[PDB]
Every structure is written in C-alpha cells, then in structure tokens.
Amino acid sequence: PGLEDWEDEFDLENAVLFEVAWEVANKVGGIYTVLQTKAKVTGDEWGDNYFLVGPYTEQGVRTQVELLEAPTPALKRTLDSMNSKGCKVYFGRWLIEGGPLVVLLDVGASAWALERWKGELWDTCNIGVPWYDREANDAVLFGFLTTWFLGEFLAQSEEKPHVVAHFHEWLAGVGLCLCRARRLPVATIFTTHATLLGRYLCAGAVDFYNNLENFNVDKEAGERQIYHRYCMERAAAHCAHVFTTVSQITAIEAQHLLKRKPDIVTPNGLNVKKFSAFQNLHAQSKARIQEFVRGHFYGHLDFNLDKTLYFFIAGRYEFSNKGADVFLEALARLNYLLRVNGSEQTVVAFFIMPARTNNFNVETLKGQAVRKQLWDTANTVKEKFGRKLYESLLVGSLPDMNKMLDKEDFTMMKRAIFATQRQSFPPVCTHNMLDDSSDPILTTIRRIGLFNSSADRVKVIFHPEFLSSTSPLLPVDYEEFVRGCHLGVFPSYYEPWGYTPAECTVMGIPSISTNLSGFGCFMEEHIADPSAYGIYILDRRFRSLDDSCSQLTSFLYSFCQQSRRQRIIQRNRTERLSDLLDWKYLGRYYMSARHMALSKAFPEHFTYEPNEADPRPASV
Amino acid sequence: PGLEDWEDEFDLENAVLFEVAWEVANKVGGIYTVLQTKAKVTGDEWGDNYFLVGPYTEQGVRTQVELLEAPTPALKRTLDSMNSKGCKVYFGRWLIEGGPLVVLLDVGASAWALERWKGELWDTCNIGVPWYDREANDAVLFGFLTTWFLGEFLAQSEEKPHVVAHFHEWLAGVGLCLCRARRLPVATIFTTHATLLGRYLCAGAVDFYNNLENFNVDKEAGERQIYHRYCMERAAAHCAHVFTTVSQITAIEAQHLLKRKPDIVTPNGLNVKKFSAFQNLHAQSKARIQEFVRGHFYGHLDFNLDKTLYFFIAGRYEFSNKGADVFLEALARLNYLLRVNGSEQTVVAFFIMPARTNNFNVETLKGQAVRKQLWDTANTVKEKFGRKLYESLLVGSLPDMNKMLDKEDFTMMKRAIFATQRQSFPPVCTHNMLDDSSDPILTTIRRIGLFNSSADRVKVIFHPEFLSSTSPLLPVDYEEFVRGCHLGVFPSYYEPWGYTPAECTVMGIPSISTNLSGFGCFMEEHIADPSAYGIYILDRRFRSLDDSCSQLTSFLYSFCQQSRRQRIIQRNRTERLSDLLDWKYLGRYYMSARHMALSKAFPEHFTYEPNEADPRPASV
Amino acid sequence: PGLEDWEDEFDLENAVLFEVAWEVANKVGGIYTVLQTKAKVTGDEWGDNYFLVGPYTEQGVRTQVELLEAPTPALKRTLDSMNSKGCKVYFGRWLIEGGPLVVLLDVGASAWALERWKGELWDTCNIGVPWYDREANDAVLFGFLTTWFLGEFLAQSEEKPHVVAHFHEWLAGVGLCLCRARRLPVATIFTTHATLLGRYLCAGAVDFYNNLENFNVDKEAGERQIYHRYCMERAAAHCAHVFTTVSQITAIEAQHLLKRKPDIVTPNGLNVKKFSAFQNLHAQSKARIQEFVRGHFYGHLDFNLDKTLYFFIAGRYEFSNKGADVFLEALARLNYLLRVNGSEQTVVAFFIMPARTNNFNVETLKGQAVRKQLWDTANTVKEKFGRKLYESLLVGSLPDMNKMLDKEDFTMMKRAIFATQRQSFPPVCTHNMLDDSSDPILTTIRRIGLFNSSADRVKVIFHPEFLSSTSPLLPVDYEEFVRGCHLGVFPSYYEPWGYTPAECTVMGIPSISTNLSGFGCFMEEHIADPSAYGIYILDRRFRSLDDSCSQLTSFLYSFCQQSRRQRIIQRNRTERLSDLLDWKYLGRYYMSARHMALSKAFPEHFTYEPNEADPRPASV
Numbered sequence A, B, C: 001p002g003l004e005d006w007e008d009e010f011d012l013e014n015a016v017l018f019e020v021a022w023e024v025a026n027k028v029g030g031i032y033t034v035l036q037t038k039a040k041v042t043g044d045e046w047g048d049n050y051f052l053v054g055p056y057t058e059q060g061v062r063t064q065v066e067l068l069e070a071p072t073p074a075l076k077r078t079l080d081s082m083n084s085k086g087c088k089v090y091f092g093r094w095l096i097e098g099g100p101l102v103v104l105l106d107v108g109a110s111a112w113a114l115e116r117w118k119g120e121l122w123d124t125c126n127i128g129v130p131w132y133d134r135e136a137n138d139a140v141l142f143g144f145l146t147t148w149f150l151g152e153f154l155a156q157s158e159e160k161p162h163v164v165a166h167f168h169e170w171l172a173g174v175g176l177c178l179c180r181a182r183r184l185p186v187a188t189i190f191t192t193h194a195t196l197l198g199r200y201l202c203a204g205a206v207d208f209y210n211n212l213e214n215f216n217v218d219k220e221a222g223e224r225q226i227y228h229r230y231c232m233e234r235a236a237a238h239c240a241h242v243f244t245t246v247s248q249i250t251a252i253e254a255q256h257l258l259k260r261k262p263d264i265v266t267p268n269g270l271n272v273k274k275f276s277a278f279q280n281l282h283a284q285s286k287a288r289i290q291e292f293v294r295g296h297f298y299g300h301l302d303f304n305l306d307k308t309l310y311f312f313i314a315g316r317y318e319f320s321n322k323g324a325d326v327f328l329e330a331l332a333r334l335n336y337l338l339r340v341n342g343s344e345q346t347v348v349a350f351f352i353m354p355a356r357t358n359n360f361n362v363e364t365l366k367g368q369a370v371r372k373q374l375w376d377t378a379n380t381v382k383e384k385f386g387r388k389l390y391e392s393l394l395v396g397s398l399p400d401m402n403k404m405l406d407k408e409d410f411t412m413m414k415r416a417i418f419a420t421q422r423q424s425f426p427p428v429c430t431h432n433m434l435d436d437s438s439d440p441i442l443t444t445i446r447r448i449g450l451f452n453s454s455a456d457r458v459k460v461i462f463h464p465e466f467l468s469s470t471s472p473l474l475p476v477d478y479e480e481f482v483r484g485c486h487l488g489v490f491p492s493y494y495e496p497w498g499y500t501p502a503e504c505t506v507m508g509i510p511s512i513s514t515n516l517s518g519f520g521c522f523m524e525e526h527i528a529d530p531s532a533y534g535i536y537i538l539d540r541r542f543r544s545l546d547d548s549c550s551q552l553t554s555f556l557y558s559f560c561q562q563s564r565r566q567r568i569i570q571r572n573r574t575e576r577l578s579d580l581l582d583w584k585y586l587g588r589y590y591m592s593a594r595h596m597a598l599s600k601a602f603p604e605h606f607t608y609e610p611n612e613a614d615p616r617p618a619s620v
C-alpha cells in the first residue's frame, strides 16, 4: 500500500539529522517505544545520517548500549575536543531493532559549568531555575551540552552540511532555544507529546475542558511553582521552525495554552509484524480464561459459560483519568437492565490496575487448588474409563455402564465433592489491600452493590498485580490475556494518546474509547461510520457525566445483544484495521515535518509544495 | 576402559597402509558396514596415512564420494602417469563417519590389457580364468591395477616408506599374489570373512561339519566349476605374511580347507554410540506391538496380553542356514507343553524374512481398520464422558452414571461391535504368496499344526516385507521394533559371523545363538556362565538335530517360566554387555595383525613381542 | 435464524410418513448422504412416525442395521402376515445420526410372484420389462411389495391414519404408480435427483442443452433400449400428487423431458456441525502442501513459494462432464499470459480423479525420500548448532561462527547436496498409467505443452489414487487437503447437483462453478453480486466453448491478481456462507412439499396457504 517512497522525492544530499530526546537509551516513559519503533524506518530513509542525543546512564549503557568508534574523522575530532575541554561524552550503537548511532552526554560531569551557564541563559532569555528542582538543572545542562556539541560539529566540519535538530520534550527544549539563540544554521523541530499544565489542571480544577479560553496560563503556572518549566516549554515551542503535536486534542490544548497552533499533527505508531506473530489464539485464550473463572467461581457456577462476555480495562492506577468510575456506574446500570429483562447473558469485568498489595488472599488460592484437584480427578477417572471401555469393547460387548466405577473412584469423586463446598460468596478482589478503607475502586463497587451474588448478572474481578507468565494463578503475559477478551472499555478523560487502546485495537479486539483521546480522534477522523469497525467513540467533550454514562451503558447493552455471527463479523472487521497504526504509514507525517523544517531553515536550497493528501468508508 | 593406546607403543614413523577391498564406496555385502565402522578408529591411529583401494562405480561416486586433489606430489605424479599410460584412476574422499582417503580404479577402462595380463598371471602362478565368469576377470583386473599402482608408488617416491597392504576377499587376493610375486617391499595381510566352498558344501552335501577331515577340496572345487576361484583364494591365503580370519569356526574351516591355520582371529565390531542414541523405549515399542497384535487378533482376543511373550527371528530367507525349521518344531513342542500344563502364558512368534509377495491380504487391512475405528470411537466417547463428568462435578454432584451415554454414543458403540464380528481364524501370514505351494515356512507351519486357534498358546506371525517406517500396518523401522521384542532366537547352522544377533545383543535383548557361529563362539569364549547374561548357546556341532531341538525347547521353556523380576535382571545384565562388541576394543586385534605383518616384512626395523593378553566372570 | 418451527404450524395429528428409497441402509449412490443427513431433522419434526422402505442386503444389515421389535401391535400383525404369506420382511433401526425406524424388504424372497405381478402391471398400466435387465425386475418387485405393505398396513389398522408416501428414484416409482392405481388413501410425493435420459443424451449427442424443445423423447428412449425405464419413470412422475426436483436445471430438464413442471424445488443440504469441527487449519494444510511440493520439485525449486497459488479439481473421472478440458486449456492460456507479463506468481494445479493405475512411479518416491533426508539432516544440524550456541553463550562469548561446523556435519550436508542432483524434469503424474496412450488428461496436457519446465509459471500435478491418510506420499484425507487449497474450479457441463463444490464452499474455500449446475443456480438465485462472496459463475448455457474458456481464464487471472488482504477478506466472506446449505434451512422446502401432498390428498381435513416467502445483498 502506502510506503515511505510514494511521493516525497527530494534532494537530500549531505544532510544530517539529530533525534534529540532525554530518554534515548534510558527507559523512563512511554514514548521510548515510539522512538524505538520509529528508529528503523527513519534510519532506513536516512542511511547513516541518523543520530540520537541523550543523557548517559550506567545501567542503560550496561544493558543495551554497545560502545563503538565513530565512523568519520569529524566525529573523532569533535569527541576529542569535547572530552579535552572538561566534559565526558561517549559514542556507540543502540542495541535495538534499527540499530541507530547514539551520542551519550554525561550531565554529571559538567557540574562545574552550571554557574556560568545559568547566568548566560538568563542573559539570553531571562529564564531562571530554582535550586531545589533537581530535574530542571539536568535539562539545562543537557541543552547546553547539546547546543555546544552542535556548534562544534558544524564549526569543525571542512564542508558544512545541512543539520536538522529534532527535540521531543521540555527536558530538551533548552537545546532548541539555545541553538536558535546562537543563530546556528540548523532546522529545528519541536514536538510535544503532553502539555505540562494539562496534568496539573485536570486534577483539582473542575471542567478543564470547558474553560480553555478562560485560562490565563501565567497565574496557574505561578501558584504551582512550575512557572519556569512552563516558561522554557513555551519559549522552546515559540522559537521553533516547525511546531508539531502528537494528537488533535493536544493540538487544541497547545493552541489555547502555548498560544501557537501546531503546523502538523504526528500520531504515534508501532510495528505490527511482532504483534501479528487469527482465531485459534483467541479461542485458546478464551478457554483458559474460562478455566480461571471456573477456578475462582467454584461452588457458585450456576450460569452458562457459553453465554458469558469478558470486559476489561487496563492502564496505570488513575481512577479519574481512565474513567473507571464511569465504567463501574455503567456496569451497575447494565446489571440492573439485564436483571430486569431476564437475560441469560453474563458480564465478567476485569480491572488490571497496579495497587499497593502484599500477598494473595486465601480464597483465590483455595479455589485454584480446588479446581486443579477437580481437573486431576476428572482426568484420572476419564483415563480409567477409556481404558476399561477399550478393553471391554475389543471383545465386542456393550459396556456395562454400572460397573466402570469402583470404590476408589467413588472415593476420589466424593473427596472432590466435599472439596467444592462453600458458604460465602467469591471475593471481588484477588489480593489483600493495604489501604482497603481508602481504595476508590472498592468503595465504588460497595456503593453500587456488586458482590458477585447468585442473582447478579455482572461479575467484577480486580487484579492489581502486574500480569506475568510466572503468576501462581494467572501465569500469562499481558498480550495473550488481552487477545482472548471480548471488549476493551477505556472511558478516559485526560490522555494525550492511548497506548493501551492502540495495542488493544491493533490486536483485533473491539474497543470503546472517547473523542477525548488522541486515538479516538484519529479513528473518528480517518474512517467513516466507526461503529461498524468495532470501535465506539464516547462523546465526553460536549456532554455531561450522566450523558457520558448513559451513552456508555447503551453501547455496552448494544454489544451484549449482538449474536455470535455479528460478533465474528465485527471481529474480522477490527482485524483488518491494524495497518492504519503502523509506522509504515504514520511515519510520513514526521517526514513532512522534516521537509517543512528544511524549507523554513534553508529556502534557497529547498522548496516544499504543501501537499496534505494523507479512506475506509464502510463494510455493510 | 581398554582404549587403542593401552600397550601398543610402537615406532610407526613413515608408514602407509592400504585397505584394499572390492566393496569400498560400493555397497554390495555386509562387511561394508565393518569397513565403514573401522575406518574412523583406524584413521585416528594412522593419521593421514590411511588409503582405500577399490573399483569405481558411477552410482557410488555420485552418492557418497567427493572427488578431491591428492595432498602429496608423489600421488600427483603417480596419478598423472597412471592416467597417461592408458588407464583411468580418480582420487577423493569417502563421505562416511571417518572420512578416509580413497583411490578408485575403473576396471572397465583396462579391457585392452586383459589378454596380456592373463598370460602373465599364468606364467607367474599357472592360474587360468574361464571367459564366462564375468566376475573373476574383474578381480584379476583389480589385482593387476592394484599391484601396478603399488609398484609405481613405491618406485616413484624419493624416499621409500614402509607400505602395508591389507586385503579382505578373494576378489582382491590377486593383488596380494601379484605383489608377493614381484617382491615388492610390502607387508601383506589377508583376512577372510567367509570360505568360498563353505556355502557350496553346506547346501546339498550332508553333515559338512562332521566331515571336515574327510574332504579333499580339489574335487569338490572341480565338479562345481569353481576350481579357479578356490585356486586363487587358497594361493592368496598361502602367500600372505599374516593370515587372519573373522571367527573361530571360520578359523577351523580355513585350517581344514585352505590348509593354513590363521595366526590371529579378528571379530567384527560396531559403533555403540549411534545405537545407544533404557526401559522407556522398550516399553513404548512393546505397547505399540500390543496395538498391532490387538489389530491382527480382533474378535479372538481371549488371552491376557500382560502375560504374552514376543519371539522373533530375522535375516535373509535361508530356511536351513538360519535354522527356521528347528525354531518351528521347537515352537510346536513348546505349544504342546504349555497346553498340557494349563499355563496362562502365550508366545507370539515373528518371522521377518523377505519373500516373493505382491500385496497385503484383505484380512490384515480389515483388522487394522477395525482396530483404528474402535480406538477412535473409544477416544471420542472418553472425551465426551470426561467433559460431562467435569461439568457435572463442578456443581458438586455425583455423576448419574446412567445418563452419560446418549443415542449417538450407543449407535457408535453398536457400529463398532458389529464391526468386530468374525467367523474365521486370523491368518498366519500378512501377505499373498506367489509360491504358496512351494513355500517351506508355510508348509512346515501346516505340518506342525499352528493356525492361531483359540486353544493354541503359541501364535505365528509371518512378515515377509522389509520393515519400514512407511508401512501401512507396521510403520516402524527394524531398530525400534527389535528394541521391543522379548527374545531373539537364531538357530543358525552355517554363518561365519552373526550381524543380526550382534545387533540384537548390542541393543540389549536376550538372544539365543549356537556354538556354530562366530558370535556364539566369541561370547562363549569371552565370558563365563553365559546363561546369566541372557545369552543361551545351542550346542549344534556335537549333537544331532533332535538333540538341538530338545535343547532349544528347554531353553525356551525355561525363559517362559521366568518371573518379571528375573526378566528385568536378565535384561539389565544384557544391557551392560554392549561394550564387548565395539571397535574401541575389537580394533586391537587388527592392530596386532598389522604389527605381525610389519615384523614379518621388515624384521630389521621392527620387532614384536607376542603378547596375547586380550573377563566377565558372573553376576549372581 | 430460520428454524423448522418458524411459520408452518399445522395440525399433524395421527399422520405417518414413509421415506421410500432403494438405497436406504445400502450405500450405492450419493443421495445416501442426503437421506442420512435429512433423517435427523425429519424425525425430530415427525417424532416416531418416520419410516424408511428399502431392500434388504446382508452386508448392510450386518454393518449398520440393528434388528429390533416394532413398537405397535399393527406392525406386529402386518409383519406376521407378511412373513406368513410367502415373503420375508424384517424390522429394525438404522445405525445413523438420527436413528430412524427402517423396514427392509427382501426382493430375492419373492421371485415366485414375478410372473403374476408382471401380468398385473401390464394389465394396469401396459408396462413391460425385458428379462435381461436384472435391475428393473428388482424395482418392480420392490414396488409391488411396498404397495402391498402399505395396503395391508392401512387395511389392518383399527383406526386409519393419514399415510404419506415419499419416493426418490425410478427404482421406487413402481410403488407410487401401484398405490395410485389401487386408490389407497395416501399422499404421494415424487422427487427426482437426475433425469434418466440426461446422462445418455449428454454423451454422444451434441448440444443437448441447446435442443431441449427439439427432442421427441420417445425415439431416443427407443433406440437405446431404455424405453421401459423412461416409461415407468415418466408414469410415476405423472401420477404424483406433488412433483419435486432437486435443482432448477433439473426442473427445466424434467419439464422438457418428463412433460411436467415441478411444483417445488428441493436443494440437497448437509450438516455443517461436523465439518466445522478457522485460519489455523488452513495454514497448517498449506504448509504441509508446501512440504509436498518441495518434495516433488527437488532440484528445480527456482520459484518463490510465498507467491504460489494452489488450484484443484476433484470428482469422478468424467473428462467432459466435469469440464477438465476447459480447465486445462484455460490453465495453458493463463500460463501464456503470466509468462508474457513477467509475473512472479505461480499456479500449481491438482487433479484428484480416479484412474486405472498399478503403483507409484520411481521419481516421486525418490523425491519424497530426498526431501525427508534433507529435513532430517537440517534438523540434526540445527539441533547441534543450537546446543553449541547455548553452551558457548552461557560463558558470555560471541559465537565463533566458523567453528560450529565440523567434519561429519559437512559430510552430511555434502551427502544431501549430491542427493539433490537431477537432470530431468519433474513428472506431471505421480502414478504409472495402464492406458497412457488413451488417457485424455495426459494427451491434453501434452498438446497444450505443460511439462513443469523452469520457465513455466503453471505446474500440473495429477493424483489419480483416492486421497487417504495412509498414503505413502500424501498421508491425508480429502477434507484436510481441500481445506488448505486456494481455489476450487469445477467447469461442469452436466451435473444435477454439485456435491463436491458444495463441500468446497461449506468448507470456506472460494470456488468457481457454472450456471449449469444445481449449486450454481442456487447460489446465483439466493445471493446478489455473487463475485464478492468468493463464488464465480461461468455462463455455459448461453455461450460457446471458446467463450466459456475465455471467461474462466479471465476469472482465474482476476483471482491471481488479488492481494493478500483481498484474499483474506474474500475468504472470510466465503466462511460466513455455510449456513445457507444446511438442512436447518433447506429442510423447509421438503416440509412445504409434504404440506402440498396432504392438501392434495385430503382437502377435507387439510388446507395450505401458498406461502413462498423463502437475502444476502452485499458486503462491499
């Protein structure tokens, strides 16, 4: 389909690009995966002219960085001068899929120059940094060393090439500000993945999404003592040849907060080849989740397991940001509706959110051991029955069915039966809370009244611990378990881009998101009639909370009323949707951003035609 | 234990050895495996001075010979002269385990010189060859080219090394005779694996083993028109520095026929590493043979399969040489004895001997299909029963055993039951004979009256076709099937060395042989109280036929009366016996023969001390 | 969806139905499976009032019939009188999925009455039967005993119920003619699956489908001496309360040949549950077919196997009826087109048609053995390499890649390499023809020039033998092999209904049929835009041969030009199409036919409203 070499035929000649980011070869956040995935295609387009600028960490260099010698004499002399001037910079490869060249800068080896660098920064842009941040000083040092390295590289080259600088986050924006300050012949691109004040204002302040035009950012930066971070972020955003954002919602957020409309939007992608390794895997995962729910619900298995649906929500433990309260309230409403209608369907909800636990509870382990004992007894009895039937059937005689069970088989069956006796109800959580009184999820469940009762048609399972293949009760990784679920509900409120819903959708599981996330807006914009492809968008921007909850309840009820053939068709449609989120297509927006940057920086040599051409209308 | 480098520390210096044999890189007989196994250790001792002399075949060079360039200039010039004088000789490697150097001589490229070579051979030793043999002419040509190559190699070498020639069979004895005729400074070793007149005299003539001293070999060579072959064989045997045989029985045969006592006996060995890849394999093979006998004996399975013993005899279709008649008569006697004693044991006899068949019979395929259908029906019913039991047992209720079978399960069971109806008796052979009237095995079975009747305690299975893993009814190779059998009975009359009993014993299966084979004599001489190690020797030399049969019957009855613990102990003892038949130990006799040859050829440089030192007394 | 109990709510009361057919409990033709599949649902609707009338065979009663006692006294007395009057009739169950009640009539026990029955038949309808048919006499006897049994059952019942007779083929039409002759109060349904003269006229006569209105059936029945069979068939068709056919093409055939328009069309169905046991199975089958083609094409594997397509045609060996010549000519044309366009795609054609063979050819077995040896060598080397890499990697050292291969590994690789040497071309057929000179398929292949050459882009594989799981080279059943193929092409000319294309389509494999078959017309009528669902209809009725061939070539070329995503979507669409051909829906037409029959026979008690209501418009 649409490859990188479609329509951007451009004279690249002697051009070098720097992918400056604070997290390269240092796993801190989530856009680490974005850089790791984009590196392969970007380097394939760029050949050997792709560099990454980032801080040095002993752990990172020990685990995934292989030190090497730089291939050009210019890098040799620049590194020699850089080490001989009182700093410490190393060179090597990044041990990832693409294997790009990396320069690592040790911010701890330049503490002597912070006093003069702060003064120069103030004399250049009137930016001050308090002494107690311990993070902004690191950003300032990283920017100073980055701009000094760029200046030395351009100055010491016999022939000056076209250098492109690309920064990603406000810990690196000081470098962009400084390189623009010193009038270096460089093309600067600034891309933001999350507004700094967005996270601060969403928590505490109410109706942050209904008051964008009524926010005078200066004060809100003032009272939180994050004024200087916003100052450098906004300054770096302003003095950029091309300004870029990751999603539309963040685009409006930056426009109303950073006071600059982003020129191009660049969604985050991923490599679909590794995830693709498609119904056998889902069937196996569903069967083994059936095994798990049989283990947990021993002694209360009064509902058909062929008409049960599995819902799940995952991510970091943010009750409000992920909208778990909305999901819980809508689950209660759906339980009420199903109980009224007398339906045979059952909904089992999973909640994978980290919490502060110590060990498992006795009930879950007891149930799992009981299930294992029942399975073993059934296997032993069925093996004995099969052997007896085979031997009695070779002699051409009908099996006398009343004599295939003897004393010890009855003893084992009886032991199993008394093992499956229970008077209480299955627990709603599989661990022991250390803050059970202050837990919001459990408090909400208690308020809405879901205790896995016999009459309840909706079951709630809370699994705080990270999902691992070595777990005593769920020895499975995140990917395989997600593959088997029926639907993923993410009623998020504030999220610049949804990594988890993207992973769910690329997997081929129908998902529910909001118009309030980058993924939701991307899907809504790039396809028509999204409901047919297994994606349901919750309108949260132009609606109240009760409206958002009723709509989500209606979506869930509509999903629960679908027949098996309808679910199969919807699942096939969502299967044939993974290629929209791969870097093979999403990498073109970054390339267009680069072309804009070169056109702005060197209009004499480069000229760009503003082509914004780039699709899935319908299937029924 | 005993390695090659134990006690033969000898100054080898510049010595070259030629392993002349007609079959090298050309699979014809059985000692091909002997050479292939001995090559690795002999070359390891000899370094790069190990050569093989043999005829050229297009198929052999295409399948397992890689042509190469000879590593020494002497070989270069000898090959160049050899090709330039009117012959055609190539050089290369043998694609086997050891990878030894091979020289291949094309006997079809020297038909021009046969007229003069026959005259020279007659003028040298008065040996004539008739024109209609088509095999002795090839031997004469091979010997002439071999001796000419040796003479050219020794003559054209700047420094003359100590050359050792080793021949193996009368197709190569002409070379030994010629090299001794031309007084070449070579050490000649002649080893025979089978006397030529032994096979001719065993068939037809009676009591060949009771009249060795009353045989005037000249006439018996005369009437059969094999006089010249015996002449060259005996002449080559006489004019050898060291005369060697493969087994003791062949030693006496050569002494009373070739009129020369062999100096050293060299038994054939094999590499035990590949065979060793030890009760799991036997259990699996026994279970699958149980599956086969269940398939064959459908509708007549009235005997316990936990008390059944499996006997087998294999090899080429020689009724008298392998003594199958003795085995059949003794099986009839044992059936009579077991029927009298009212024992619950059952003996199933296998006969793996190639015959002239066309296809399988209908009965065996029908039985196998019936068994497969029964197995499939049992598996389906047992799966359904297990699933129903599991679901009914999760709810903590005892299985109502009278409702786990429904209409279609009863239908399938009934269909199987009417499928297992048979009025006739199982066939004694699994194929269709083209000479059923003239078959000796079937005639003997009919005479002794074993038709697999219900009252019969001994079952006979005849499997003419080669045992292959792709067979429709026995998809198994020889090794795995032999691993699972209980006992291997080989009442051989004439066999210089037993490859099949050796393979059976190295495998770890108790076996019965005779004092009339090389393997039997070897085992009897090298261990004390052989009965405890799972080997039973039948005394056939000093006894009549009726005596040999009664002794074999007694041996079989004693084996059948053993308990399970006794069988386990005997099997472990026979397991710990494989290292006696490996080239790691059996290769020392060849090395001693080489030392004798060098001592005889060049007494000035070499002197040997006649050490004949080389053990398993008992275990209960 | 649409079940049997949708809209036909009707007072059935005391009604009995007889499913008269000559093949019940006697496997002869193909509609045996139709009856076996329809029995379950028909008996479920009918309770215990479903009977089958058919001849007695010892083999059938021994293998799949369980004799039982009839549950009603009326059947007791009728059977007693029937046996006491000089005939021999038994009672029992049919050992099939539904388990319906069966009455079996021995036609060989009533040879005494044929003389009077022939005279009575002639005096009733002037129908004569020649003495040398040996099949029409059996039909006459079956009809006489059937009508006598029906008359005795209705006469001897204390209260007379509403009896329904259903016949299926002209071997049973005599019964319908006789019951209509004797004015029994019975509802008669006649259904034909194939016109008798259709098969006779398609062979020999030209343009049978362009001359229906110009055929005066009397003569063509006359010259072939099949006049009396057509006479009884047409007479039975005329004197039927309801006339039924299996397909539209047969409907027009009966209208223009039997001179009676069929009231209702009843397509044949099947149970989709057993076939459904869906991409994992196809992937496994495709991989193993890749294994097979690797084995067959050793030494000529110069084409990519990831861009190869597998076509297949199967059925009985009818060159003209199945249109194999058209397929071969179009394959040649497509090979020409692909060779011109320089495409990388390759087409491998399979031909599963029984022939008169004796054994396999040497080349195929040699290739399979070579492939097995290569696979074994690769596995051994890869295991050794993995073990060495693991051990050398535990010590934290990079693998010295130049030392992981030693002498014996190189020897094995070399042996494999010389094993894969071949000078000739792969054979077009895997067996040895006994009539290679007179074989039409091979003659056509030779004429069109497809010898599996290197430059050829289309490969032809002919597999005459029945496909079995025990085959030496293709140990697979029909179902699993068909599951893995890419497309099934059936350019049939004369076929009343396509069992093989129906099995292919219900499996989920895109298929090509003609408007000239029952399946093709059914699909064309019941869906709109058939090309989107993976079915391509060849217009053969209104077109010449060259037109039919060009259209098929265009269809194949269009299929070959599809991308992988297009193929996946088409395959999912054809997956979601199996429920159209199940008896859960196709069984309603038979039920409507029954209601028509009861309305015609007893208008006083029953009245039917002519509802002909019964759908898949499109997806893209």
Ligand SMILES: O=P(O)(O)OC[C@@H]1O[C@@H](O)[C@H](O)[C@H](O)[C@H]1O
Pocket (backbone or CB within 6 Å): A279, A280, A283, A286, A486, A564, A567, A568, C278
């Ligand atoms: O999760 P479900 O709604 O039960 O669907 C799971 C379905 O099970 C089986 O019918 C097949 O494996 C289908 O391929 C799969 O889609």
Ligand SMILES: O=P(O)(O)OC[C@@H]1O[C@@H](O)[C@H](O)[C@H](O)[C@H]1O
Pocket (backbone or CB within 6 Å): B278
């Ligand atoms: O524990 P070890 O001394 O290594 O002995 C373990 C031996 O390994 C292999 O040789 C065989 O499986 C033996 O049956 C087993 O006894």
Ligand SMILES: O=P(O)(O)OC[C@@H]1O[C@@H](O)[C@H](O)[C@H](O)[C@H]1O
Pocket (backbone or CB within 6 Å): A278, C279, C280, C283, C286, C486, C564, C567, C568
């Ligand atoms: O036969 P093909 O055109 O190669 O399609 C086979 C395809 O292979 C893999 O991509 C998947 O298993 C698909 O589910 C399957 O459809």
